[model samples]
Target: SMSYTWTGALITPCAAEESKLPINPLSNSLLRHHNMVYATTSRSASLRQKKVTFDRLQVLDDHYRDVLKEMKAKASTVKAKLLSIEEACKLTPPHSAKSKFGYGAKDVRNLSSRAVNHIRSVWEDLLEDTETPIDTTIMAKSEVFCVQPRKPARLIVFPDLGVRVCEKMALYDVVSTLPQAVMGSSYGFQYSPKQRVEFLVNTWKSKKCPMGFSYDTRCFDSTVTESDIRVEESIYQCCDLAPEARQAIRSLTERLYIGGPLTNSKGQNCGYRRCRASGVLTTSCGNTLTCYLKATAACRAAKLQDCTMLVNGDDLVVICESAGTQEDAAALRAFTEAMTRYSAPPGDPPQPEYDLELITSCSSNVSVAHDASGKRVYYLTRDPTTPLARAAWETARHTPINSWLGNIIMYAPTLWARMILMTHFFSILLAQEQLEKALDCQIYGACYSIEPLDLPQIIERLHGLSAFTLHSYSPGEINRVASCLRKLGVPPLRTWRHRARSVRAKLLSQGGRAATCGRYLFNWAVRTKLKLTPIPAASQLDLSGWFVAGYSGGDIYHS
Candidate 1:
């Protein structure tokens, strides 16, 4: 351990001694980078500093009271009704039910002095001595986060943590949970400048919010044996914006030994396979190649004001992302020239350096608003990463990015969660005093356990829940399609009369048997995970007009 004294560590209620958190034998993604973060039996983390602005100490109490009021006195224990919603998402889908980004509203900064002090301790030598595997570890040091929906459901229920059970976990459990436990957050979550929120608003925003759901679905073992190649490549390509940032990334990747192939004599390439790494890919003609996606994210950190980015001889260091649009590339250069532009001594290393990478997928200016490609597989930082495994991950990433974008779009002026996770230090790591200062979180970590489970009871509950057959209005687009939806809309779900005709027509078009299982497989995926929004009842249009066509709430949306 390149030891540093804890001169600026943050202290908070949840802040446990270094010996307390989980000891991480191995970290996947960026989690593999921190020294302090460990993993073990008591691996759960709770929202400390208890922001109590809500006036009720027990969140369930507030949920109950609010539910009772929402039912207009017809309710008999609101807890039962709310748990019912949680139950459905578990057995089936979230339906039109609204999901979210933060546990509740974001509590930006407002951390304890102790928290700042801890962060202050590592403030100086940040970019100076680290690179690659070692340098990237700084990311693990400061715990930052964004949110994602947890699937398969969490085994834990609301009886424990006061926070509500979401359709998805905010971040992938394997990546976010372990390290966060190691590095406690006094100020939780972050704010993004390039951030955007996209949510499906419900009639229940002001009504009683659902809390106390049981999440028994454990995260699947997706321990990445290799760095995510796509993310690294994406980041590398984005370096078109700056060169120093690019070099920082190259150096860092090299240190982690996660670097792409280093060119050799005869102009050939091959994997720089390191001691503990795996399947570093080969470029076309016998040369080794590394996916540079994550490295790109490192380069972009230079723009996030709340965090820092750096480069050491061969290592690239990171505090977190710096926020700026791709448009900010020019502004950054101009600003550097005007202010901190003096040339550093030759080969002198930078301390506390970082380069923030941004998600440029934010409107790739496909003016036609077309997607680059969907269902088209991109090679992961895969010497051997599976496409389906990556697809599972991509799907998981979308759920949160969507909900996070939801906040800023519908609500009154909220910062995007992306910006915070990517840019702000507090967005990633919190100071200890920051948590101490939150002694008043409206609800303590109450009701944070898993809910009781009964598969039979869940099926019964599923029946009572009104199943809205996903509807896509057409015939308006074509002429015959609208009539089909009108008829189907009145029929009970799982039992539509026109369903036979629909199936027959498809089978006939394909010369028989309806490609039966495949359709069911795709449909199950749609209904359960993709939650395809604009499904139309019939195919009234072409691929370009997909969302507007059959199964109107189609998986195709951007256009």
Candidate 2:
């Protein structure tokens, strides 16, 4: 069957869209290559549609079935409960799309009578009708990136707000708990950035002769088949669920979860989707489970020894004992073939790598740098092109997602993040006197409202005090940052050092949390650095649920 059937209706936008970075003094200071930065819009949705629409072929064998059985056995140990309507409503993001029925996210959050009644109606309809394909809004997601080959906009298909609430009622607890239970430490969302690097390093060192590779599946959501979604449902059904929860889950699977009708922002019928919807509540956990199942089965077929997998949705990295170089190369080819047979082919064919730093997963790689004491430390880093591009966009325009703050928090120790992102954005905020204002950013797919003033303590808690004092970076990492700065037309490191010194002086004059920020975040800029100490407030931060699961498109917010 076709993954999608279009009715020739176009994907439309609700308002004017900006495709290029706008010219602004602040943004220009951070990036001068304005033409190199581009944001995807609805005009490019058709191109993405062409690429994602395709037939899928899946042939399950004994290895696949064996993995499924094991997953089910683990899943059966779990017990999950349905969320009350009010609880589910509170989880909706404030900026979530409003429903067609006149209620909005704010109303739902406040438990307005009209919103509660509508939600109850939607739940009743789910119990009564099991086969009606729900209508979903298909919109092109506006994401910023540096122009390489000019990728198309990714489509996000999601149902109405009322139905979304019902989805939370039926599956929220299940998605949150099930993947960790089934995959254990292999669940990539369970680890912080620091913990993630530690796991990767330990796994690499554990191998007699470490051979590793990161797998990239092409349009993984589009590759999912009806059978695959059903199989996922079976695993969820293994959990001890409430009777209403079971019925709601089954109805959602048949009507909305498996596939649905697509409507444009203008309310025109766009098409039908038979593949996985990228914006559903189950998207993160479903992809994680499916990717893990296929990769584990493929590992067995390749006869790989002692395979340890780290899976975060479609992103995967496997570390295992090596044969000879030639044999290891051959084994990867076999692994690729098995994955392709299972309907998840690689975008770039996998190649065995001997060095841990050479293997990138979740767009991050393990890199070495020296702490203030000249002790070797391993931290995660990625190419700064996209992060810098998004930072420029955010600086010039008011946007919902603040990738800069998220980058600063997640990649706090990286030279680019520390020297470029932090220095650039903090200077802007300081100028505007908005350092105490809270802005939202996502970490491991969960939305967090973080204040710029609290960054000193936040960084201390997540990355440790060493993040502020790291220096003597590896040559490869330094070259990457330097080349990225040149390509983006960003200021050189020396300029940032001078600017940071000024920012630090201004912050220190304030003499409170702002002073703490200056003392810690800009320690690198000064010749005689203030002695770094552990922040007492860092110990009191409630960081629970920050890295527990991935919720990228799940419409979740933590108040």
Candidate 3:
């Protein structure tokens, strides 16, 4: 792209010295070929601009048609056998109404961490430490989401215009809990009482949108629970990849348990008398402030732990979210704890590492289905035990899930819900073609991670794979790749928060059939904003937290 420089107008200058300002030679060639080609046409500027859109992207259109045809064929692939497979893959068994009564928000809340760990464990048990390599292995990494505890936030969802259906999952919890606090869950209006989490997310946003919850991602006092408060809409509305620190690192087990102040030395209740000090403070914040006061805001970041890579073993590097707040001290504590609980003690020589590529998008908080009662419209989610298990993708990889995930997706929906979800998941690509246009195939020139490799080996491999000859990127061209990422992605972090959240939530949810179809929207937005570049497997000795857009080399399309 051409850049510009300012100079004196033909007539005048702001100052005498400015008249001789140099002009940038590269600026003129930056014009798009589309604009140049159109300038010679009769169409207006706006019409010419329209010519460069997704519908007109030749290669994408071709792939789109091919995928559409494949989708049609997959429609008939599910049968009783596939149904059995779906059952085998399902993370949970269908619970009876009696079995479902007590479970609520807490169970659903833990899904992200649990899901990641479960996936990684499953893959490792089945795949790793084997002579022959296998397909995907789950990384027992923690994908964390922080909420203003108890502050019910309306999850923002952005559906590509073709959204077939969108509903909230956490709807029922609100209906049940609110009325119990209000007129009584038994006396609430709107839909009849339901306990499903997906229903609650929908209810909070749709039926009873703009809800509130004070304090952190938890609850405050009943008096502060105002309905329809704007500040409560804190759900950033997105999904995400796990933190790079999630790899199998030896130090991941390194722990430090700081003993709390021997006494309530902060004197949170110094003004109160002895009796009050003896009893729970019963203050608005609810901590005694005397016996067991937590660190609270006392724990501030005076400095950052410089960015570092998390090694899973010798070969695999840990995947990560972003930096700064990405791993809060609290989260860091939890992650290390999780690693210790699930992973093996730092051991023998590690396996060769695999290249990591992260793309952040909103998980669809909107998952829908048609049950026996007609269209059982709802957002899918998960339980504490199930976590956010990986879905069995159908339609196409990285494409928004549809038919395969819906009623028609399973061969024996009655017996095999879990297997269907694991083996075949869908991508957001289908939900909104526009989003796909913005992301797919088009290698973001800015997002390259370059490694100075022994080209001879690469060339040899290329020759063995195909007859095509090799070429190299010029230094200037390689540097330009990073700039392009900043140009396109930075603007979205500010403007596309909701859409990104919705997409992220949907993708991360992994179709567990819960409330709020998507999860991890906030994480995704943060990750995407970091605009991480893909680094080569053998060369990423120094990388952590993704970039908003940078690259290892110039091939977003090829591995």
Candidate 4:
């Protein structure tokens, strides 16, 4: 069946869309080539539609069924609960899209009678109507990127606010707890960046003559078939659920979850979706389960030895014993063939990589750098292009999502993140005396309101004190950062170091948390640095739910 059937209705933005970076004193100070920084808008939705619209054919075999059975068996041990209306309302992001049926996120959060009534009505509808397709709003996501090949705007399809709240009530517990239980360590969202790097290193060392590769599934959401969605529903049904929960899940699967009508922001019919919706409670978990099943079956088909997979939604990395160069290459080809037969084809053909650093997964690669004590520390890093571009945008404008802060948190140990992102953003915040302001950033798809002053403790707890003292990075990692900086026309490291020293001085003058940030985050900028030690506050920080799951488009906010 076709992934989508489009109407003549245009994908329109609700507000003014900026395609090119707006030149400002702050953004110009961070990036010289404003022209290189561009944001994708609704105009490019047609291009993305052209790329994503395609016929899907799926053929499931015994191996796929075998994995499904194993997953279901593990899933059966789990017990999931339904979230109450207030609980679901509290989880809604402050700035989530408003309901066309009258109430907004603020009203829902405040437990307004109108909002609660509407939500109750929606849940009742889910219980009664098992066949009517739920309506969803389709919009093109506006995200910043460095202009190179230029990516089209990614489409986001999400149900109405009332239905979304119902989704949370029905499936939030299941999505949160089931993946880790079923997939175990193979579930990538269960680890922090530091733990992720450790897992990759340990997995690589565990293998004899290790060979690994990251799989690139082209338009993974679009590749999902109705059968795959039904199979996912079966897995969820394996769990012990409340009667209401079971009915809601079944109705959602048939209505909102499986496929739905696409409506534009102007309330016109845009098209219809027969594939996975990018924005939904089950999206992350569904993609992870589906990708894992397909890859596991493909591995068996290729006869790959001792494969250990790390899956984060559609992004996958598998490390296993090398079968010599020729055999490994041929094995990857067979694996691709198997995946294609399962309807999830590769964008870039998989290649056998003997070096762990060369295999990028989840947009991150493992690299080595020396801590202050000169011991080799393995850390995760990625191309700084998108991060830098997004940082420039954040600096120039006020946006809801703080990608810079998220990057700083996830890549805290990286030289580029520390030297450029932290120094640039903190300097601006310090100058404006807004260091105490709590801004929202996402870690693993869960939204968090983080204060800049708390970064030292957060970094220490997540990546350890070594993140503050890391130096002498590997040349390959250094070269990648340098090249990215050059491409984006970002300031050189020397400039950032110079600026960091000034920011460090300003922060130190403020004392308290500001002084702590200066002493820890800017240690690399000074010739003689403060002794890096374990943060006393780090151990006390409650980071339990930070890395538990991915909620990219789930409308989740952790207050």
Task: Count clashing pairs, candidate 4.
Answer: 0
Tens digit per residue, CA lDDT, model 1, 1-559: 1001122222211233232223222112212223322222112211211110011111112322332233222211111111222221232111221112122111112223432333232222222434523211100011112122111111111110111121111111111122112112211111111111110011112223211100010111111113322223232332222332333334333443232222211223311222112111111000111101112222233232332211111122223323334424443443222211111111222222121111111111000011112221110010101111221222223221222112211111111111111111111112211211211000011101111111112211221111112122122222322232232221222322234334323433442222321132123223333222322311332222111111111111121
**Clash number by candidate, in order:** 131, 0, 111, 0
lDDT of each: 0.20, 0.92, 0.20, 0.93
Model 4, residue 30: distance off in Å is 0.8
| lDDT of candidate 3 over 248-270, digit per residue (tens) | 11011111000001111121211
Q: Identify the runs in model 1 with alpha carbons over 4 angstroms from their true place.
A: 1-108, 120-125, 131-472, 475-559
Query: Pairing residues by index, what is the TM-score of model 2?
Result: 0.99
> Which residue runs does candidate 2 get wrong by more than 4 Å?
none
List all candidate RMSDs to the true structure. 26.1, 0.9, 30.3, 0.8
Per-residue lDDT of candidate 4, residues 33-117 (tens digit)? 9998889999999999999999998888888989889999999999999999999999999888999989998999999999999
Ten contiguous residues with the weakest lDDT in model 1: 438-447
Once fitted onto the true fold, the runs of candidate 3 whose alpha carbons sit more than 4 angstroms away are 1-194, 198-367, 382-559
lDDT of 2 by residue, 218-268 (tens): 999998889889999999999999988999999999898789899999899
Best by lDDT: 4
